[PDB]
Swiss-Prot record, chains A, B, C:
The gene is env. This is Transmembrane protein gp41. The chain holds residues 543 to 591 of 856 of the full protein. Residues 55-72 are annotated as: Immunosuppression. It comes from Human immunodeficiency virus type 1 group M subtype B (isolate HXB2) (HIV-1). The mature envelope protein (Env) consists of a homotrimer of non-covalently associated gp120-gp41 heterodimers. The resulting complex protrudes from the virus surface as a spike. There seems to be as few as 10 spikes on the average virion. It is a single-pass type I membrane protein. Acts as a class I viral fusion protein. Under the current model, the protein has at least 3 conformational states: pre-fusion native state, pre-hairpin intermediate state, and post-fusion hairpin state. During fusion of viral and target intracellular membranes, the coiled coil regions (heptad repeats) assume a trimer-of-hairpins structure, positioning the fusion peptide in close proximity to the C-terminal region of the ectodomain. The formation of this structure appears to drive apposition and subsequent fusion of viral and target cell membranes. It is found in: Virion membrane; Host cell membrane; Host endosome membrane.
Length: 72, 72, 72
């Protein structure tokens, strides 16, 4: 999803800030960990959708396989 | 999986603790990075299973497509 | 992918270093957050490929379902 891409871009922005600050940092590290957690949660949501999409495709292919067996 | 949801909830708990501590913190940030890494590893395991599930569906649909071609 | 496994192993290495340093640490935490972000980005790439793989399987099964309907 574009949100995962948006959360990643925000993590990239915060990462550059934390590295530059390395060269207030602790707050940035904590915020960055929240940025990463949000990304992981968004990826989890899409991953869960693909899991259900795979099971629906499994059901559709099984119905076709059974139709072809039944036609014999 | 429910484990990924459990690892995420633990990361959410540790995140609230680190933010509240921001308002011992370093240990919490290190632990939180382990919580995130465990989540990423669990997501990787489920992602790998979906990759193999997709290839098995590909093989099943290909077998049906070939059966239908062969019947002609 | 093996890259995600390589990024994870690097995060595991950096995590052990940060925990041992807990027992220079800030640089290690920042680097570890970059290791995690890279993992999340790599997982996002594979996740996006599975999403497109699922839609192509959907199109293939739909074509078979339509062929079978049309043959009647």
């Amino acid at each position: 999803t574009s949100l995962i891409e948006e959360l990643i871009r925000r993590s990239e922005e915060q990462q550059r800030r934390n590295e530059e600050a390395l060269r207030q940092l602790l707050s940035g590290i904590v915020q960055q960990q929240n940025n990463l957690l949000r990304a992981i949660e968004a990826q989890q949501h899409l991953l869960q959708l693909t899991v259900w999409g795979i099971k629906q495709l499994q059901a559709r292919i099984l119905a076709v396989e059974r139709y072809l067996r039944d036609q014999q």
